[PDB]
Design a protein around this motif. Structure first.
Motif, mmCIF file in Angstrom:
data_model
loop_
_atom_site.group_PDB
_atom_site.id
_atom_site.type_symbol
_atom_site.label_atom_id
_atom_site.label_comp_id
_atom_site.label_asym_id
_atom_site.label_seq_id
_atom_site.Cartn_x
_atom_site.Cartn_y
_atom_site.Cartn_z
ATOM 1 N N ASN A 159 0.858 -1.192 0.000
ATOM 2 C CA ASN A 159 0.000 0.000 0.000
ATOM 3 C C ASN A 159 0.886 1.230 0.000
ATOM 4 O O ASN A 159 2.037 1.183 0.442
ATOM 5 C CB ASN A 159 -1.044 -0.010 1.127
ATOM 6 C CG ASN A 159 -0.459 0.301 2.482
ATOM 7 O OD1 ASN A 159 -0.002 1.441 2.740
ATOM 8 N ND2 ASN A 159 -0.505 -0.679 3.385
ATOM 9 N N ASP A 202 1.173 4.007 1.652
ATOM 10 C CA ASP A 202 1.761 4.535 2.884
ATOM 11 C C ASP A 202 2.898 3.622 3.374
ATOM 12 O O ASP A 202 3.969 4.071 3.816
ATOM 13 C CB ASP A 202 0.666 4.719 3.936
ATOM 14 C CG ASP A 202 0.997 5.854 4.951
ATOM 15 O OD1 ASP A 202 1.967 6.636 4.749
ATOM 16 O OD2 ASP A 202 0.291 5.932 5.958
ATOM 17 N N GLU A 259 -4.277 1.871 16.524
ATOM 18 C CA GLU A 259 -4.616 2.927 15.573
ATOM 19 C C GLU A 259 -3.761 2.881 14.307
ATOM 20 O O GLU A 259 -4.157 3.420 13.275
ATOM 21 C CB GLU A 259 -4.492 4.313 16.218
ATOM 22 C CG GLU A 259 -5.611 4.660 17.178
ATOM 23 C CD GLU A 259 -5.899 6.154 17.203
ATOM 24 O OE1 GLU A 259 -6.755 6.562 18.013
ATOM 25 O OE2 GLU A 259 -5.287 6.922 16.403
ATOM 26 N N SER A 260 -2.592 2.245 14.388
ATOM 27 C CA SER A 260 -1.702 2.123 13.215
ATOM 28 C C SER A 260 -2.029 0.936 12.310
ATOM 29 O O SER A 260 -1.422 0.753 11.274
ATOM 30 C CB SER A 260 -0.236 2.073 13.648
ATOM 31 O OG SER A 260 0.044 3.206 14.461
ATOM 32 N N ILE A 261 -2.998 0.122 12.718
ATOM 33 C CA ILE A 261 -3.352 -1.066 11.939
ATOM 34 C C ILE A 261 -3.597 -0.787 10.437
ATOM 35 O O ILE A 261 -3.185 -1.587 9.590
ATOM 36 C CB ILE A 261 -4.498 -1.842 12.612
ATOM 37 C CG1 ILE A 261 -3.910 -2.648 13.789
ATOM 38 C CG2 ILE A 261 -5.201 -2.754 11.598
ATOM 39 C CD1 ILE A 261 -4.974 -3.211 14.755
ATOM 40 N N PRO A 262 -4.214 0.362 10.082
ATOM 41 C CA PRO A 262 -4.374 0.610 8.646
ATOM 42 C C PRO A 262 -3.115 0.562 7.787
ATOM 43 O O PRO A 262 -3.217 0.330 6.587
ATOM 44 C CB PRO A 262 -5.020 2.005 8.619
ATOM 45 C CG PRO A 262 -5.888 1.980 9.853
ATOM 46 C CD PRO A 262 -4.998 1.324 10.884
ATOM 47 N N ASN A 265 -2.645 -2.488 5.609
ATOM 48 C CA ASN A 265 -3.624 -2.862 4.583
ATOM 49 C C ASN A 265 -2.988 -3.499 3.348
ATOM 50 O O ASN A 265 -1.944 -3.063 2.880
ATOM 51 C CB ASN A 265 -4.496 -1.665 4.160
ATOM 52 C CG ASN A 265 -5.787 -2.131 3.500
ATOM 53 O OD1 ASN A 265 -6.328 -3.204 3.845
ATOM 54 N ND2 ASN A 265 -6.261 -1.366 2.517
ATOM 55 N N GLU A 306 -10.223 -1.873 13.772
ATOM 56 C CA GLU A 306 -9.224 -1.570 12.721
ATOM 57 C C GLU A 306 -8.839 -2.813 11.932
ATOM 58 O O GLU A 306 -8.777 -2.788 10.709
ATOM 59 C CB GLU A 306 -7.966 -0.904 13.308
ATOM 60 C CG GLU A 306 -8.171 0.510 13.863
ATOM 61 C CD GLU A 306 -8.674 0.568 15.312
ATOM 62 O OE1 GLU A 306 -8.908 -0.490 15.960
ATOM 63 O OE2 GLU A 306 -8.809 1.705 15.828
ATOM 64 N N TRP A 307 -8.604 -3.923 12.636
ATOM 65 C CA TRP A 307 -8.223 -5.137 11.960
ATOM 66 C C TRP A 307 -9.374 -5.619 11.063
ATOM 67 O O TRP A 307 -9.169 -6.041 9.933
ATOM 68 C CB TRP A 307 -7.846 -6.206 13.000
ATOM 69 C CG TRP A 307 -7.438 -7.513 12.399
ATOM 70 C CD1 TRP A 307 -8.239 -8.605 12.198
ATOM 71 C CD2 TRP A 307 -6.121 -7.893 11.959
ATOM 72 N NE1 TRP A 307 -7.509 -9.627 11.658
ATOM 73 C CE2 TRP A 307 -6.203 -9.218 11.504
ATOM 74 C CE3 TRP A 307 -4.871 -7.237 11.929
ATOM 75 C CZ2 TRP A 307 -5.097 -9.907 10.990
ATOM 76 C CZ3 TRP A 307 -3.760 -7.924 11.425
ATOM 77 C CH2 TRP A 307 -3.885 -9.247 10.955
ATOM 78 N N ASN A 319 -11.468 -4.070 9.501
ATOM 79 C CA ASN A 319 -11.657 -3.225 8.322
ATOM 80 C C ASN A 319 -10.570 -3.358 7.259
ATOM 81 O O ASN A 319 -10.713 -2.831 6.148
ATOM 82 C CB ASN A 319 -11.847 -1.776 8.735
ATOM 83 C CG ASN A 319 -13.285 -1.479 9.134
ATOM 84 O OD1 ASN A 319 -14.069 -1.016 8.324
ATOM 85 N ND2 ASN A 319 -13.641 -1.809 10.356
ATOM 86 N N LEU A 320 -9.508 -4.109 7.560
ATOM 87 C CA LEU A 320 -8.495 -4.375 6.555
ATOM 88 C C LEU A 320 -9.115 -5.126 5.376
ATOM 89 O O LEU A 320 -9.940 -6.037 5.575
ATOM 90 C CB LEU A 320 -7.333 -5.203 7.138
ATOM 91 C CG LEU A 320 -6.533 -4.529 8.247
ATOM 92 C CD1 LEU A 320 -5.632 -5.548 8.951
ATOM 93 C CD2 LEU A 320 -5.672 -3.400 7.677
ATOM 94 N N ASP A 321 -8.682 -4.787 4.168
ATOM 95 C CA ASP A 321 -9.158 -5.463 2.958
ATOM 96 C C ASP A 321 -8.958 -6.977 3.036
ATOM 97 O O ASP A 321 -9.884 -7.750 2.758
ATOM 98 C CB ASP A 321 -8.444 -4.941 1.715
ATOM 99 C CG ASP A 321 -8.771 -3.478 1.408
ATOM 100 O OD1 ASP A 321 -9.711 -2.916 1.985
ATOM 101 O OD2 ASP A 321 -8.068 -2.892 0.579
#
Ligand SMILES: N[C@@H](CNC(=O)C[C@@](O)(CC(=O)NCCNC(=O)CCC(=O)C(=O)O)C(=O)O)C(=O)O
Ligand SMILES: [Fe+3]
Length: 292
Positions: free
Chosen positions: A189, A191, A209-212, A215, A246-247, A249-251
């Motif tokens: 990804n 980022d 909070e850094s889980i995104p 992705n 957060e987890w 919501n990961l693709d």
């Protein structure tokens, strides 16, 4: 006599070394792969003192201590003619190592191609090293073909390698598995790729909070923290992090594209040549890709 330029300077090797001491896991693996059984090696990170996959090739290899701080007296007692070190583990004792025997050093422990090339030169096994690397390159090329055939317009996939530890979580964006996935044509990804472009290899994360940042189209999960005093804490971390919104919501998580319980030895600890081929085999299996 051979002069070698390496991460810690220049080293003169007299002769074809026959008594080599390897100070990181991957160097031990590479020595074995090149047909040279080390007289001394640092202990394995798990399955101590020697990883199951390699221990029968290390019978009579003496253990010289723990990778973060090997025992220089034990190295000295082996009367080595070559020491293979890394800047990351051994920068501060490099001069002390050089007083024992000619010592060559890579920058880090996980760039197994650099370890293979360096050790090929140091050991007078250049042709063997070249053949090993050709074999890896072939396997990589075949994997890319088989991946493209399965995924078609969706190739290349984005991947992340998430490592739950006792008290934090890491992403191996580069590092051992991250670099191999990069060879195989997986992408990251934007980022995460920016972190890599900024020179980061292994990202330590302290906040859910850094889980995104994790992705990806597929996520490879490694439970590993060799020096944790309490093995259960890695599972507690995994439980807490994978339970978060957060987890979820990961693709890859939404799409049921998570490979769980991967072998930490293959995926990170062994660090070497043999595991690279094994990791690629793992991917055919975990991704259900036809070797077509
Ligand atoms: N972690 C602990 C226990 N060791 C491991 O779990 C394995 C490994 O050390 C392997 C690795 O490839 N490290 C990267 C080396 N390059 C660096 O830049 C230093 C990073 C580092 O070693 C660290 O920050 O832990 C690992 O951490 O994955 C330690 O080191 O005693
Ligand atoms: Fe480490």
């Amino acid at each position: 006599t051979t002069s070698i330029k390496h991460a810690m300077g220049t080293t003169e090797i007299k002769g074809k070394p026959k008594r080599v001491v390897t100070l990181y896991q991957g160097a031990t693996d590479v020595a074995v792969s090149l047909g040279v059984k080390p007289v001394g090696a640092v202990e394995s990170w798990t399955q101590k003192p020697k990883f199951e996959y390699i221990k029968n090739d290390l019978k009579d290899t003496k253990i010289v201590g723990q990778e973060p701080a090997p025992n220089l007296e034990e190295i000295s007692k082996l009367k080595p003619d070559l020491i293979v070190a890394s800047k990351v583990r051994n920068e501060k004792v490099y001069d002390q190592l050089s007083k024992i025997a000619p010592t060559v050093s890579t920058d880090t422990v996980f760039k197994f191609k650099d370890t293979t090339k360096l050790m090929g030169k140091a050991l007078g096994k250049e042709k063997e090293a070249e053949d090993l690397l050709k074999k890896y390159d072939d396997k990589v090329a075949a994997f890319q073909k088989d991946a493209k055939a399965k995924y078609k317009d969706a190739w290349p996939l984005k991947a992340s390698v998430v490592n739950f530890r006792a008290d934090h979580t890491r992403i191996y964006a580069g590092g051992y598995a991250g670099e191999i996935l990069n060879d195989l044509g997986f992408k990251r990804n934007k980022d995460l790729q920016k972190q890599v472009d900024n020179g980061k290899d292994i990202i330590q994360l302290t906040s859910k909070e850094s889980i995104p940042l994790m992705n990806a189209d597929h996520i490879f999960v490694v439970k590993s923290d060799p020096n944790a005093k309490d093995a259960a804490l890695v599972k507690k971390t995994e439980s807490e992090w994978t339970s978060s919104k957060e987890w979820k919501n990961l693709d890859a998580v939404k799409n049921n594209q998570v490979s769980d319980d991967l072998d930490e030895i293959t995926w990170n600890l062994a660090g070497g040549y043999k595991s690279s081929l094994k990791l690629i085999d793992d991917l055919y299996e975990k991704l259900n890709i036809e070797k077509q």
